[PDB]
């Protein structure tokens, strides 16, 4: 009978004051939280942030909403959330978040006979994640979502992960183009500001980069360009136009690779290991072109020595480049 | 007791005229400001602005909200902020700002028995910072945030920094990849417009650009090509093929470098320091080629004077280039 339910609901909201928290002036109200991750869209090094879509559920108790005579959970229209008290929960490290609103505002209010309120939202949030790129491409990142009460201190509100470590679900079926989620972690603490101590929850992920993306995008092209640069040592030094064109083309294409990689990462003043590797590849192609110039200069005097320089280079360049790659890859160990 | 507190708050808001400021028609009301900086997300030279996230707290006294008998500071739900008078504070140089609204509008209202109101907001603002890049990439910037009353003159409202120099915190949290905060400064003043005099607070930051090998690698190609152009002076006139090859190589490489740097440097359509440096290098290689042409012209008439001209150029060109570099690095540093 909907008439009885309407009478009950109208009675509950009769004289209800939304400006006062449950048990105002007494012990803190305890809010339990669940998160169901639906996706982690775009981890960005350039912007130092990531996007996250989730179902965010909050659980508290308000004795002003206890009802009797109806043995049911009352799922109410979500606009009822505007007539009740809700926690002022927010994400400290976010930059732009919204609550989905098609076809209606993605919100859920469910009441239970003992006064317990379940309040659910569907949120897409972009959250900051500062990254350490000194070990690119073998770097490992740690990205967090920080959850805090904006206005109420620990004397008025309390947070806990509802369900222990089983509070956050859906993490194990997240696929990223470049990373893999090695681990996630749940933490609870108190954080002190000039206005007092506030409860805090933290959900952290550890991301590990897949080297298959750095390869096939930056490494394989560099190796191919260096091989093409070496090719010129097998042509007679009479063919000046061919060798000059080959050297210039290799230099310009290696410069393109360097600039492209530098643009895919944020601009920082210092020099990383990967920058050293790309500079080494550039040095190798430029040294091949310069060796041709040196052979051409010395050809007028001792053509036999001019040919011997090419013969020696045919062996020296591949060997030294292989040793350089080995040294670079053993730097990371 | 929640009912007693509800009736007290109802009495507070009973007959409360929100349209009138505190002490309307009398002395001005003093509002103290606090800012806690979360981050400075980005600093754009092309758009000439920077993005700032902050907790902005305002402190004032309203005698209409004084209450007695409750020895507590009442933290009210942020929706109550719509039933209270708040200052019409605005930022003069902001271009696009918003208050974060997940999961609720990040707003805080705290009352004290004396009638004192604390009002806190979490705000992201894209503030305009007109930059002088005539010394790029070794420029120093000064980016400000201006805080002002819009509708109330100094006969109605007063502004001050609460705590003095300790009114702004979190400058250590600012982590710009490309800049480094040198200093921050707090200013209080009055600004006169055609409608009267208004209070003004001003928070300014001094920024220094970080210099690295990547800043260094913009001058090195030009310097190397200039030295290559010098090299031609040591070649005998009989081997003019080498001299002309050096001339054409240097001129083409220099022009290509200049056009590429125009393409890659940030699109700022006025003269900077590096533009003049590149122009000077181009002038030097052009002068070297012109000197070769003059020597080739006078060769058949004054071979001894031609050799003397080459020998004197061998010293003059590096000397004048060192002089040009010295003048440049003393004027722009």
């Amino acid at each position, epitope marked *: 009978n909907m008439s009885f339910v309407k009478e009950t609901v109208d009675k509950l909201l009769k004289g209800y004051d939304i400006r006062l928290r449950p048990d105002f002036g007494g012990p803190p109200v305890c809010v339990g939280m669940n998160i169901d991750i639906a996706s982690i869209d775009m981890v960005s090094e350039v912007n130092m942030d990531y996007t996250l879509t989730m179902y965010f559920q909050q659980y508290w108790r308000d004795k002003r909403l206890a009802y009797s005579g109806i043995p049911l959970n009352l799922t109410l229209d979500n606009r009822v959330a505007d007539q009740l008290w809700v926690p002022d929960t927010y994400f*400290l*490290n976010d930059k732009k978040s919204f609550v989905h609103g098609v076809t209606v505002k993605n919100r859920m209010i469910r009441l239970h006979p003992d006064g317990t309120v379940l309040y659910g939202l569907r949120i897409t949030t972009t959250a900051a994640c*500062m990254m*350490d790129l000194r070990r690119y491409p073998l770097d490992e990142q*740690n990205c*967090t979502l*920080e959850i805090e009460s904006y206005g109420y201190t620990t004397d008025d509100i309390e947070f806990y992960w509802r369900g222990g470590d089983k509070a956050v679900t859906g993490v194990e079926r997240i696929e990223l183009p470049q990373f893999s989620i090695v681990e996630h972690r749940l933490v609870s603490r*108190n*954080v*002190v*500001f*000039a206005t007092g*101590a*506030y409860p805090r929850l933290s959900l952290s992920f550890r991301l590990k980069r897949n080297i298959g993306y750095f390869i096939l995008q930056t490494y394989m092209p560099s190796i191919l360009i260096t091989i093409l640069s070496w090719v010129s040592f097998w042509i007679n030094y009479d063919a000046s136009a061919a060798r000059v064109a080959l050297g210039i083309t290799t230099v310009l294409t290696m410069t393109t690779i360097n600039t492209h990689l530098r643009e895919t990462l944020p601009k920082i003043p210092y020099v990383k290991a990967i920058d050293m590797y790309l500079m080494g590849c550039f040095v190798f192609v430029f040294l091949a072109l310069l060796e041709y110039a040196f052979v051409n200069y010395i050809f007028f005097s001792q053509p036999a020595r001019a040919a011997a320089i090419d013969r020696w280079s045919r062996i020296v360049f591949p060997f030294t480049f292989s040793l350089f790659n080995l040294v670079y890859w053993l730097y990371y160990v | 007791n929640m009912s007693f507190v509800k009736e007290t708050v109802d009495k507070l808001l009973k007959g409360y005229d929100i349209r009138l400021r505190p002490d309307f028609g009398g002395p001005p009301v003093c509002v103290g400001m606090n800012i806690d900086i979360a981050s400075i997300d980005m600093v754009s030279e092309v758009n000439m602005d920077y993005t700032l996230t902050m907790y902005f707290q305002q402190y004032w006294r309203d005698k209409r909200l004084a209450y007695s008998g409750i020895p507590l500071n009442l933290t009210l739900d942020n929706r109550v902020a719509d039933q209270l008078w708040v200052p019409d504070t605005y930022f003069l140089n902001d271009k696009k700002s918003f208050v974060h609204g997940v999961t609720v509008k990040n707003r805080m209202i705290r009352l004290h028995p004396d009638g004192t109101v604390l009002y806190g907001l979490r705000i992201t603002t894209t503030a305009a910072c007109m930059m002088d890049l005539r010394r790029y990439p070794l420029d120093e910037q000064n980016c400000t945030l201006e805080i002002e009353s819009y509708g109330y003159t100094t006969d109605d409202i007063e502004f001050y920094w609460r705590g003095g120099d300790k009114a702004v*915190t979190g*400058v*250590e*949290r*600012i*982590e710009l990849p490309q800049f*480094s*905060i040198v200093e921050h400064r707090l200013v209080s003043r009055n600004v006169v417009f055609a409608t009267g005099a208004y209070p003004r607070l001003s928070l300014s930051f001094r920024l220094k650009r970080n210099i690295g090998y990547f800043i260094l690698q913009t001058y090195m190609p030009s310097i190397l090509i200039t030295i290559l152009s010098w090299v031609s002076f040591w070649i005998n006139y009989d081997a003019s093929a080498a001299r002309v090859a050096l001339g054409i190589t240097t001129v083409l490489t220099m022009t290509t470098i200049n056009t590429h740097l125009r393409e890659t440097l940030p699109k700022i359509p006025y003269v900077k320091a590096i533009d003049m440096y590149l122009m000077g290098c181009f002038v030097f290689v052009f002068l070297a080629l012109l000197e070769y042409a003059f020597v080739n012209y006078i060769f058949f008439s004054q071979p001894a004077r031609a050799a003397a001209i080459d020998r004197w150029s061998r010293i003059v060109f590096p000397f004048t280039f060192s002089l040009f570099n010295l003048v440049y690095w003393l004027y722009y540093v």
Partner: nanobody
Amino acid sequence: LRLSCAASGHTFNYPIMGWFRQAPGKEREFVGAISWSGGSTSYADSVKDRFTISRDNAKNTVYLEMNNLKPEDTAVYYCAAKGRYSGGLYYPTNYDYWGQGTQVT
């Protein structure tokens, strides 16, 4: 008198090192704090313009240089690390990893 605090490990997650001193009959008191990267510094009023804080990443170490010592400085000194989103800078509770008590007279 110069104090050294050498921090090793995941120092990127904890970008701020702070210094505290505890009196024999009082609680821990903030002295100063330095950012790992920018070197930005903050000091207490009682120690401002007397103490200085510096750091170097060559061995991941921070330094507190004490000048114009007073009998009021007799306290056991600690060095602590603070996370990126841990709130206020002047509160010992926000600091996760703590050093070893050093006696200064």
